[PDB]
């Protein structure tokens, strides 16, 4: 694997994607979820009292480069999960790039969904205006300032379980084998600390199911979550039925569905028919799109496993192109 190249592991039916990170000296490998919707780097530690027995835990005592920090932290994600603990400092090796002196957040407590998932913690890739502790420099901030990347970018390829899973993150570069055509440049709004974009319209066949709306590119959100009127409008196009819990029940037979097409900055990006079905349970299928009571959409893995994204922290802007498949 090339410099700053991190091969990802697809968990379940495109639930999430994690990669290995080496923390400490001599260091241990941690499977972290790469999240563009958050900016805190936290990991399960031996200070943890409700952590999974399966999780790999960071042990201060076994890293000769650990440095104590008197600050505490606590986070609350949008799916109701959380974690809390203490700050510390150590070295993080991301794809061969050794970030020296990264602020790592060691978990003392964590939600049970963390304890039972595949992750040892999270790597956040949002802007630093949203770190939970003021003054923390995120890993991207550090790669740039330590000169480990020459371009303030990361290229993201998320695979489809249907095709073998996988995925790959490249810090300071991108891979044109993973996409097709020309990249489209889309300006980013980071005023709320996220990768915000504007979708000009959404169509299904010849029907305009939605006009322009804002969304955030979130690699760490499984589905495409839309504001209530938009979701409703999309579901009507597919005969999906509201399960009343932010999810829809859709036909398992996607063969007749037309793709959901997003018009972003003049180009067409889609959610292929197959991605319209998230999961099949005892012959009932959950749709790849859901609803939330937000004015903005959460453009999650349903969309990202269909379109390659180059994230530029410097401008900021993104470059999108249809995945090559």
């Amino acid at each position: 694997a090339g410099v700053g190249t991190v091969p990802m592991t697809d968990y379940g039916n495109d639930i999430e994607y994690y990669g290995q990170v080496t923390i400490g000296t001599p260091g241990k490998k941690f499977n972290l979820d790469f999240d563009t919707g958050s900016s805190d780097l936290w990991i399960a530690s031996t200070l943890c009292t409700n952590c999974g027995s399966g999780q790999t835990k960071y042990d201060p005592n076994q890293s000769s480069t650990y440095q104590a920090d008197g600050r505490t932290w606590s986070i609350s994600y949008g799916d109701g999960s959380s974690a809390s603990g203490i700050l510390a400092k150590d070295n993080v090796n991301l794809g061969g790039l050794l970030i020296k002196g990264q602020t790592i957040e060691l978990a003392k407590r964590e939600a049970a969904s963390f304890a039972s998932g595949p992750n040892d913690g999270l790597l956040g890739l949002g802007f630093d205006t949203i770190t939970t502790v003021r003054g923390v420099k995120t890993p991207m901030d550090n790669l740039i300032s330590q000169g480990l990347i020459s371009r303030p970018i990361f290229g993201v390829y998320l695979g489809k379980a249907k095709n073998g899973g996988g995925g790959e993150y490249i810090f300071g570069g991108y891979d044109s084998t993973k996409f097709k055509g020309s990249l489209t440049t889309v300006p980013i709004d980071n005023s709320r600390g996220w990768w915000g974009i504007t979708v000009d319209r959404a169509t299904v066949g010849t029907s305009t199911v939605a006009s322009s709306f804002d969304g955030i590119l979130d690699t760490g959100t499984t589905l495409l979550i839309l504001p209530n009127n938009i979701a409703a409008s999309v579901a009507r196009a597919y005969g999906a039925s509201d399960n009343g819990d932010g999810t829809y029940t859709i036909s398992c037979d996607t063969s007749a569905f037309k793709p959901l097409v997003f018009s972003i900055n003049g180009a067409s990006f889609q959610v292929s028919p197959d991605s319209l079905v998230f999961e099949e349970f005892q012959g009932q299928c959950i749709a790849g799109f859901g609803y939330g009571n937000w004015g903005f959409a959460i453009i999650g893995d349903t969309f990202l496993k269909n379109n390659y994204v180059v994230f530029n922290q410097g401008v900021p802007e993104v470059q999108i192109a249809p995945v090559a498949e």
Binding site: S39, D40, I75, S113, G220, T221
Partner: peptide
Amino acid sequence: XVVXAX
């Protein structure tokens, strides 16, 4: 599902 710092 999972929905990461809202």
